[PDB]
């Protein structure tokens, strides 16, 4: 019921961007589940459902597809991290 109720909320207030931010960062999920005082077992069932909701939103909204701008914006904001992580990887091997 509660989880079912929560999903109907993430569709009202939360934007797809904000939902992904919540799903992608583990610091963010904790601040969410702990602040909500959720049980751990129910927490995973919920994290599973939002992933599901996040996936249904992406299919629906071409803006989040490869050619979609929200995707390329997400990809632009993530780029500085991927670059440095790949740079560090190479130094080791090389």
């Amino acid at each position, epitope marked *: 019921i509660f989880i079912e109720d929560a999903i109907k909320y993430f569709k009202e207030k939360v934007s797809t961007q904000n939902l992904l931010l919540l799903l992608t960062d583990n610091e963010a999920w904790n601040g969410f589940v702990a602040a909500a005082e959720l049980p751990r077992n129910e927490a995973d069932e919920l994290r599973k459902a939002l992933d599901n909701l996040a996936r249904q939103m992406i299919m629906k909204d*071409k803006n989040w597809h490869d*050619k979609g701008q929200q995707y*390329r914006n997400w990809f632009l904001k993530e780029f500085p991290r991927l670059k440095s992580e790949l740079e560090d990887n190479i130094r080791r091997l090389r």
Partner: antibody
Amino acid sequence: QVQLQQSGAELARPGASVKLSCKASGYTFTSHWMQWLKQRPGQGLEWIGAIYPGDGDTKFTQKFKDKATLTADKSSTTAYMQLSSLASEDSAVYYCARENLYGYYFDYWGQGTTLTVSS
Amino acid sequence: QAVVTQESALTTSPGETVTLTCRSSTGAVTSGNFANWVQEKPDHLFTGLIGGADNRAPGVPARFSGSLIGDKAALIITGAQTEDEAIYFCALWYSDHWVFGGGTKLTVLG
């Protein structure tokens, strides 16, 4: 085979309202945005709005927000467009077309409803 | 309020390559605008040709291709046939709505 079958009143009075309908068959109705367009006599296509029969979400050009109302029936798989406050500029042929979800092209089209707004 | 611009008219001959273009008033046409082309033939026969700038719809001949050149979106007909005499509409996506251009009337000589 995907088919789009349109229907609706072909004559309306000024200031009145009318509801046009688009019956979809041959695919998963909830999965694709249903487009609505118009072509006035002697002009090109104009896009009005779209609806996602999955959750009833809609999109509009500002111009048509308080004029066109988009709805969809999941069970009969028919999209509807209600037009309000009809005027002369609303006389046109109205088309419904599917936006292929991942193609993004408009692949299948209704045969169009001809609407005249006159007294 | 966004404005989409196409050539009003172009001529070509059988066999030749011809290019139609689409321009956006807000800036360069990008992948996020999902450049969409539809062909209008007599008795209001509309046919979806291209989606997302270069996705060619099933059933569309190979001689049609789509691309972002410029600045703009382009429709290329590599070896035009007399049966390609039509009006070509280009539509751009602006976040939450499509805007159509005025269309190009393509004449095939001969």
